[PDB]
Design a protein around this ligand. Sequence first.
Ligand SMILES: O=C(O)CCC(=O)C(=O)O
Length: 241
Amino acid sequence: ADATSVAVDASISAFPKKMGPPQWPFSTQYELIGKGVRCVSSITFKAYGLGIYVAAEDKHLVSEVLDSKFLSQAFIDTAAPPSPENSHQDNLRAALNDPAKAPILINNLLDSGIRLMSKNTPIKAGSFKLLMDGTKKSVLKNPDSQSQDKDRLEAGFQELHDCFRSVKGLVARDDDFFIELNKDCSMNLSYYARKKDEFVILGTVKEPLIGKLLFAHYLAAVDPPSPEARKEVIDALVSLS
Ligand SMILES: O=C(O)CCC(=O)C(=O)O
C-alpha cells in the first residue's frame, strides 16, 4: 500500500483512497470513508473486502442533512433530548449508534441525493457468489421493506439478479465488484477483472428502492455486513457534520 491506498486484507489489493474517471469507469470522483472485511461467522472465514466511498462533490450534504435541526425534530417526541453541552457531532454520533434512531437517520441520508459507492472485492470466490444469491433475503430483513410496493421491490430485485448473473461467471479473488448509488438511488454496477486489467459495465438498477435497501444495510447499526466498515463510515460522517 501507498499513502494513496489503505490495506484491508493481505490476500487482496490495497484500496485506493480516491477513485474516479477516467481511471475508473465511474460517474464522479469518490473518496474512501470506511473499509473492512466481510466475514461469515468468524474472522476465521473472510468472504470479501468492503470499501464504502462518498462522492467528493457531495460531502457538504452530510452536515446539511444530518444537522441539529433534523436530529431534534426526528426524535423530539420519542427520546429524551440530547444534553445541551454536547457538540452536535457527539449528539449525531450517539444517535447513529442507537438502534432506535440510526435507521431513521440513515434513511434520511439515503434520500438526500448523496452519491455513494461500495467496492466489493472477493477474498473467497465461492462464499462471495453465495452472498450474492442471499443479498435480497439479507436486505429485506430490514422491517422498513414491508411497507413498500411489493411489485416494485420484486422488479428491482430482478434487475439486480440479472446484473448478478453476469458477475457470478467472473468472480475471482482480488477482482472488484463496484456498486454506485446515483443521486436518484438507481445504481450503476461495474466489474474490474484485475488479471485482464479490464472493466465490465454490468448495467443499471433503475428501481430506487433497491439502492436504498442495500446501502441502508451496509450502514446498518445492527447486523451490518461488515461491522468494522460501518463503524468507520459513521465516524467519517460525524466528522463531516
Ligand atoms: O453482493 C454484495 O457484495 C452484497 C452482499 C452483501 O451485502 C453481504 O452479504 O455482505
